[PDB]
Design a protein around this ligand. Structure first.
Ligand SMILES: O=C(C[C@@H](CC1CCCC1)c1nc(Cc2coc3ccccc23)no1)NO
Ligand SMILES: [Zn+2]
Ligand SMILES: [Zn+2]
Ligand SMILES: [Zn+2]
Ligand SMILES: [Zn+2]
Ligand SMILES: [Zn+2]
Ligand SMILES: [Zn+2]
Ligand SMILES: [Zn+2]
Ligand SMILES: [Zn+2]
Ligand SMILES: [Zn+2]
Length: 203
């Protein structure tokens, strides 16, 4: 099964593990995981996180043929479980100094969900992309500006977290994957760049 390939100790997730647009697994609602985690579900989370680290490392991205990435959902690896990893980096300053925090968000989330959100909407000004999508998809992907999520980590400990800015956009994108929603489902059907008043455009 997919999961058996993925969790072999020597296996590194790369682009050949990523299923594509059209594969029915991207359109399912993923199955809740139960605690304590199997060995597999735990190893799967570490691999997914390892993949995002690799994709942001100039050397490993080049060794593995990996495109830069900040989130990955298990549906994208053909695994219908409610498991996402998020790794959102902070940026150096004009002087070249690393940030205090390497990441604004670094987490493997089991059973994540949006429990509440803002009336206000937000969109990345640059559109969104997807590891599974090999097309140029222009337009504003309309999301919530702010969300409160709950989720479990690999110990089964429950977290309640509020997010805004880019972290919020990233997490919504990944949660959508475990619900069978693709980014272009939240792009206006007639005008991709339609701005409804009040929309927070993130630069
Ligand atoms: O397909 C992806 C990667 C996507 C995540 C996103 C989260 C928000 C926008 C994209 C990504 N593309 C470029 N960087 O990250 N995640 O499911
Ligand atoms: Zn592989
Ligand atoms: Zn069930
Ligand atoms: Zn472990
Ligand atoms: Zn490594
Ligand atoms: Zn929502
Ligand atoms: Zn709502
Ligand atoms: Zn995606
Ligand atoms: Zn609750
Ligand atoms: Zn459409």
């Amino acid at each position: 099964a997919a999961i058996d390939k993925l969790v072999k100790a020597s296996h590194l997730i790369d682009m050949n593990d990523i299923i594509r647009e059209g594969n029915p697994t991207l359109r399912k609602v993923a199955e809740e995981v139960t605690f304590p985690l199997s060995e597999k579900e735990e190893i799967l989370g570490e691999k997914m996180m390892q993949f995002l680290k690799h994709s942001q490392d100039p050397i490993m991205a080049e060794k593995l043929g990996l495109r830069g990435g900040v989130g990955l959902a298990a549906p994208q690896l053909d695994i219908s479980k409610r498991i996402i990893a998020v790794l959102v980096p902070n940026v150096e300053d004009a002087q070249g100094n690393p940030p205090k925090e390497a990441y604004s968000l670094q987490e493997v989330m089991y059973n994540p969900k949006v429990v509440s959100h803002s009336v206000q909407d937000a969109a990345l000004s640059d559109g969104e992309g997807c590891l599974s999508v090999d097309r140029e998809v222009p337009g504003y992907v309309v999301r919530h500006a702010r969300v409160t999520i709950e989720y479990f980590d690999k110990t089964g400990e429950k977290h309640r977290l509020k997010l805004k800015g880019y972290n919020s956009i990233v997490v919504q994108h990944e949660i959508d994957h475990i619900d069978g929603i693709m980014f272009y489902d939240r792009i206006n059907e007639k005008n991709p760049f339609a701005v409804k008043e009040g929309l927070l455009i993130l630069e």
